[PDB]
Amino acid sequence: KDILCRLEHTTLRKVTANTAIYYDPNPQSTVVAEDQEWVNVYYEMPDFDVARISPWLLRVELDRKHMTDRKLTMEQIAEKINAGFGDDLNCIFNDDNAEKLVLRIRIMNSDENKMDDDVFLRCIESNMLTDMTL
């Protein structure tokens, strides 16, 4: 079954439960209340996003059952995003201990400082749910 998991084509659309685009310009004050508990962990010592980051944010929820059934964890997924998009996307994600798997995405500070700052998150999202392969 491990080999099957490595053979079977898996995309984020298979492991994600739901996804939403949130507008929260200041990451220190997440519009999602529950994110603040875990997002504060990362934004306590921000890196590469201290100066600037996209005010828009894409939040993805992943189904634990599909994730565990495919033996997929957030680590390689977050890396696979940066493996696909490069450093274009600041990708930040909650601990495995959380009831729901959450990863937070913003467009890079230099692109904020490629098509648009907001709507291209739909291009990113739909591409991540379609072409991006885990």
Partner 1 sequence: GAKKSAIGQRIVATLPYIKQEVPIIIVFRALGFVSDRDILEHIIYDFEDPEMMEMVKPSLDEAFVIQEQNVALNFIGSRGAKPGVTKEKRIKYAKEVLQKEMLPHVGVSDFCETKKAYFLGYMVHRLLLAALGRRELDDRDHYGNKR
Partner 2 sequence: VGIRFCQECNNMLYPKEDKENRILLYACRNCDYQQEADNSCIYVNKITHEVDELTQIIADVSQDPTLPRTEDHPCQKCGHKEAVFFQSHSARAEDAMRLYYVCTAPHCGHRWTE
Partner 3 sequence: GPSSQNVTEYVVRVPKNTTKKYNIMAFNAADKVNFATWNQARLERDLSNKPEDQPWLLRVNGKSGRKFKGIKKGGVTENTSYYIFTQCPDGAFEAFPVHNWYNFTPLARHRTLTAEEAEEEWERRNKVLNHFSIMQQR
What are the binding residues?
23
Q: How many CB atoms lie within 10 A of CB 127?
A: 14
Tell the smallest beta-carbon distance from residue 122 to partner 2 (Å).
7
Tell the smallest beta-carbon distance from residue 112 to partner 3 (Å).
16
**Which two three-digit tokens encode residue 55?**
């005010």
**Which two three-digit tokens encode residue 104?**
């937070």
Q: Is 68 helix (H, G, I), strand (E, B) or coil?
A: helix
Residues 6+ positions from 49 with CB-CB distance below 8 Å: 27, 90, 106, 109
Q: How far apart are CA 42 and CA 78, in angstroms?
A: 14
Tell the smallest beta-carbon distance from residue 21 to partner 1 (Å).
12
In the complex with partner 2, which residue's Cβ is closer, 6 or 131?
131
In the complex with partner 2, which residue's Cβ is closer, 18 or 82?
18
Q: Which residues would be at the binding site for partner 3 (CB under 8 A)?
A: 115-116, 119
Over the window 49 to 88, marking each residue x when it contacts partner 2 by CB under 8 A and - when it does not, the resulting string is: ------xx------x-------------------------
Q: How far apart are CA 48 and CA 108, in angstroms?
A: 8
In the complex with partner 3, which residue's Cβ is closer, 4 or 115?
115
Residues contributing to the annotated binding site for Zn(2+):
23
